[PDB]
Nucleic acid binder design. Structure first.
Lengths: 124, 156, 146, 100, 54, 47, 114
RNA sequence: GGCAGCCAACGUGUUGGCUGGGUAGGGGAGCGUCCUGCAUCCGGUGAAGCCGCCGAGUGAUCGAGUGGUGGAGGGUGUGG
RNA sequence: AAGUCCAAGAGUGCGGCAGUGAGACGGCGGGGGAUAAGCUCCGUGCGUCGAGAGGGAAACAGCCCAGAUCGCCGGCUAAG
RNA sequence: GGUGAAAAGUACCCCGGGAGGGGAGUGAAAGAGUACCUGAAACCGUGCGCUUACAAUCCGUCAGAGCCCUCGACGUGUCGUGGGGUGAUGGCGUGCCUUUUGAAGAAUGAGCCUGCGAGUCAGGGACAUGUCGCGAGGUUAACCCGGGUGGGGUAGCCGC
């Protein structure tokens, strides 16, 4: 029973090269060099799927802080005040309001400032 | 690599040539070299216990008898001259299934020849009756003598 | 999905910052903030969404301690021994806009977008600037208290 | 008017007729789901108090259940021989907000 | 010395594009009634009939 | 009726040969032998 | 699509790169201008190219019944062909490989309006 | 919100609690190849192969889904 | 005596199969050294790397936080 | 090694010295032209789309403008539960294998593709487990008879 390593062998090669369609140079043409980049490609995909949440939260925080400064409040005091007021709007939607509806963000800024302690620096 | 022709000599020096160390042009990696673990002639027959063989056959015959797939016959055609047309007609009147195992005695050359040329009809002797044959056949047609011989040889 | 600034979404304003008596670090930090656009809720780090900043009176910037004579701006030409150094005082004397601009590009990101951001920093050493036709908005550096 | 609905552990800004993909829901397509709200904004009014939000619920029709993109995990450690291939298709529910 | 690494196809192509021929500048000349095109350097030779205009 | 296509082995009668040396997913590379040594290329005798 | 004629000079005894060096001088040009450029181009690979282009124009005039003056070399390209492998002996009895390369020069001339 | 390993409960497989980084290595279960017993099904109304498209699977991989080339053998089940 | 106890996936015994038997650094206790070495040799129900991704030490196996089953464009935090 | 079922292997046109081709023909097919079944990859072109000449890039990944196509919608050209190509820009990002305490390592091997290339087989072997058969018994070896698997074979072997 002599089996040729051709039908079976080409399947993973076609898969890896199809995935590598778009890579520069050998990484898109040679199965071996595409496989090396595909290992790194999916390692990065996993890493960046897990870091995308953090980096989008960073973007949201940057925008919320921008709107907070516009509304004359600090971002951390804004978050403190929102928590004290019991506003459970996450940073994604807060930044959405900051960008689309600045009046809503000003309303929430007023809420957070109202719910802040009379003295933020007091030990409480 | 020891059976393929040539390859006795070390192809080239051990060191200095910048090439991989080869000890023969017939090593397995070489094109045209020898097969490492390729097939060798083997005797696949297995010493299955006699009781296991007999029980498997009795079980196959039991399955057929339970399903009413065992038929008996005094003769296959009529005697003397074989007649495939007559034998096919009779096996049609008996069973409409395709695979039929005709357990016929050694002496009934007439019936053997007559039924021999039907496509899905294996012919076996009562002493050679075996699992694979009975299981492969949809029906089992015994000549009365063949059935009696099998029953005698087994009850004995 | 989160808002992404499209083609016709980056509106840039013009801020003029008076550097007289302002700390170099403060001025540069606030200028870099404006140039990046960290003050806009539409901020996106992959976009040059910032505002033009015109620093005036760059020659009367304020430093602290002995940095005016013991802090050196270095440059290497590539040729061996080609390390020139000029104290902040000498640099203010020769190229007054230099000190402030170097501080601001230092505080900017170091990449292609950073160098595209630099183009919006129009620092001037005199009390006057040419961009009066832009109606630049005066910008005082204020701290959002807590 | 738009509400920041809470559904599937996440929050989504929606308005009447907006379509959102959310985590899976135990409702057949065409069924209606009442989802709690983190904040409603009606033009100018902003309902932020949890007391007044617990009384407003965003109603949404389940258009269908879909499967998200095919994530292909291939955990790899070099000089180790450790590869682990894995796949994922998150089960999501598509909701069209009927109103608030 | 020997090339330490295979040159990337991009670098190979960019350096290989520099091996190109320059198109000769062709000037019209009247030979035997019909008009032909020859290099301005061979213009005098064509006028004097010294160029084998196939 | 029972047929040759109905005959199957007993549950747990047959076990899949272990294909050693085929990829890192199964017993790959060293083939269950570990790194260098005598036992990486030969069987040390029992005595 | 403008009417067109093809011509394939196959197994030309010129390296495909050298055939291309002269093809680039003419691709897209009128047939008459292409033939003049190839006539005065120093590159010896120009003769096969000129012959392919002339054959394309001749096929256009005869087999397609097109006006020669309206023809331009629409798409001309030289592909690699079979390579013969020869041996060049060198110092210390080391045999290097010489590659006698060939090229298939394909010309496709189109009859474009004036 | 999805999957998987152990365990329990009751059922006639649902739930729940824990637990699921991993080299040497151990155990378990599988994908794919071609060769065949048997059984079936597809094929000059176009098999395989190859190139795609649209997709599919928790993985190896899959398309008795499809289009191009093709020209004659293939698939599926269940075993060896 | 309790706790842990739908688990530590514990301990012990007997079997199938192993791999390992080159360790590294860090804290503490020590020998050799010059109470040098990123030195060397020990002890350490000490840790981590080895075989460990993620965050922090800038970068930086061994340091600090923390042990990656998968997906979220949710939230709270550790070291910092 | 493989044209095609059959040589029907291009009587006679055109470009060329020829090669080779374009016609025209044979052929079911010339996407079978004695370079010939199928015709993969490497490799080399050409055409089109996007992108790039201020930029420091393990060549990816995640966000992602712009541009170019596709499927729907509404039937304004703009929005969508869309899809595909390209990728300005930003974040993150130190090849694979081997061997190591530890390698992206400036340690080893690999220029690339295709094909091949390594725990296999014999034995009433040994041990252990699974699974059948029969069971205080279980098996038979050689050999004999069967155009086959089947039937005999009580010598021995292991139990006891």
């Amino acid at each position: 029973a002599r089996v040729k390593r051709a039908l079976n062998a080409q399947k993973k090669r076609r898969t890896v090269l199809k995935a590598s369609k778009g890579y520069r140079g050998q990484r898109s043409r040679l199965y071996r060099k595409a496989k090396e980049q595909q290992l790194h490609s999916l390692t990065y995909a996993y890493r960046d799927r897990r870091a995308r949440k953090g980096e989008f939260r960073k973007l949201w925080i940057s925008r919320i802080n921008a709107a907070a400064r516009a509304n004359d409040i600090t971002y951390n005091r804004l978050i403190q005040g929102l928590k004290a007021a019991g506003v459970e709007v996450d940073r994604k939607n807060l930044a959405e309001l900051a960008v689309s509806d600045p009046a809503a963000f000003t309303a929430l800024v007023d809420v957070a400032r109202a719910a802040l302690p009379e003295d933020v620096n007091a030990p409480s | 690599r020891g059976e393929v022709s040539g390859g006795g000599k070390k192809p080239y020096r051990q060191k200095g040539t910048g090439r991989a160390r080869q000890g023969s042009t017939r090593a397995p990696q070489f094109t045209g070299g020898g097969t490492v673990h390729g097939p060798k002639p083997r005797d696949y027959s297995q010493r299955t216990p006699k009781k296991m063989i007999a029980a498997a056959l009795r079980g196959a015959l039991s399955d057929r008898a339970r399903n009413d797939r065992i038929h008996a016959v005094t003769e296959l055609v009529e005697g003397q001259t074989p007649s495939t047309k007559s034998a096919k007609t009779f096996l049609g009147t008996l069973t409409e299934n395709k695979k039929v195992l005709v357990v016929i005695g050694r002496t009934d050359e007439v019936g053997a020849k007559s039924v021999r040329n039907l496509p899905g009809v294996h012919v076996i002797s009562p002493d050679q009756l075996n699992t694979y044959d009975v299981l492969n056949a949809d029906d089992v047609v015994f000549s009365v003598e063949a059935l009696n011989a099998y029953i005698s040889a087994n009850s004995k | 999905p989160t808002y992404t600034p499209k083609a016709g979404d980056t509106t840039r304003s013009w801020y003029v910052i008076d550097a007289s008596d302002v700390v170099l670090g403060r001025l540069a930090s606030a200028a870099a903030t404006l140039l990046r656009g960290k003050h806009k809720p539409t901020f996106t780090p992959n976009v040059d969404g910032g505002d033009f900043v015109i620093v005036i009176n760059a020659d009367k910037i304020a430093v602290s301690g002995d940095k005016l004579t013991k802090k050196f701006a270095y440059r290497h030409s590539g040729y061996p021994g080609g390390l020139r150094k000029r104290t902040i005082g000498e640099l203010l004397e020769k190229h007054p806009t230099r000190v402030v601009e170097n501080a601001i590009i230092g505080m900017l990101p170091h990449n292609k977008l950073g160098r595209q951001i630099q183009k919006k920093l129009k620092v001037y050493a005199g009390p006057d600037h040419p961009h009066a036709a832009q109606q630049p908005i005066p910008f005082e550096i204020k701290q959002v208290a807590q | 008017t738009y509400a920041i609905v809470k559904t599937g552990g996440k929050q989504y800004k929606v308005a009447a007729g907006d379509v959102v993909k959310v985590e899976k829901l135990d409702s057949e397509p065409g069924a209606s789901v009442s989802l709690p709200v983190a904040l409603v904004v009606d033009g100018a009014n902003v309902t932020s108090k949890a007391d007044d939000l617990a009384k407003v619920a965003v109603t949404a029709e389940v258009l269908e259940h879909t499967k998200g993109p095919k994530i292909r995990i291939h955990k790899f450690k070099n000089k180790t021989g450790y590869h682990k291939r894995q796949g994922h298709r998150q089960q999501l529910t598509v909701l069209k907000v009927t109103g608030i | 010395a020997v090339p330490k690494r295979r040159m990337s196809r991009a670098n190979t192509r960019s350096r290989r594009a520099q091996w190109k021929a320059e198109a000769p500048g062709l000037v019209t000349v009247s030979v035997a009634g019909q008009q032909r095109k020859v290099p301005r350097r061979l213009l005098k030779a064509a006028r004097l009939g010294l160029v084998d205009l196939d | 009726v029972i047929k040759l296509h109905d005959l199957k082995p007993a549950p747990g009668e047959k076990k899949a040969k272990t294909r050693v040396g085929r990829g890192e997913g199964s017993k790959g590379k060293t083939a269950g032998r570990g790194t260098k040594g005598t036992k990486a290329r030969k069987n040390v005798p029992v005595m | 699509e403008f009417p067109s004629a093809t011509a394939k000079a196959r197994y030309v005894r010129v390296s495909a790169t050298k055939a291309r060096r002269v093809i680039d001088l003419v691709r897209g040009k009128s047939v008459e201008e292409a033939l003049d450029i190839l006539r005065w181009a120093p590159q010896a690979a120009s003769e096969p190219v000129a012959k392919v282009i002339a054959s394309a124009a001749a096929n256009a005039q005869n087999n397609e019944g097109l006006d020669p003056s309206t023809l331009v070399v629409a798409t001309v390209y030289a592909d690699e062909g079979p390579t013969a492998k020869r041996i060049r002996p060198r110092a210390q009895g080391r045999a290097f490989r010489i590659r006698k390369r060939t090229s298939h020069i394909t010309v496709i001339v189109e009859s474009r309006p004036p």
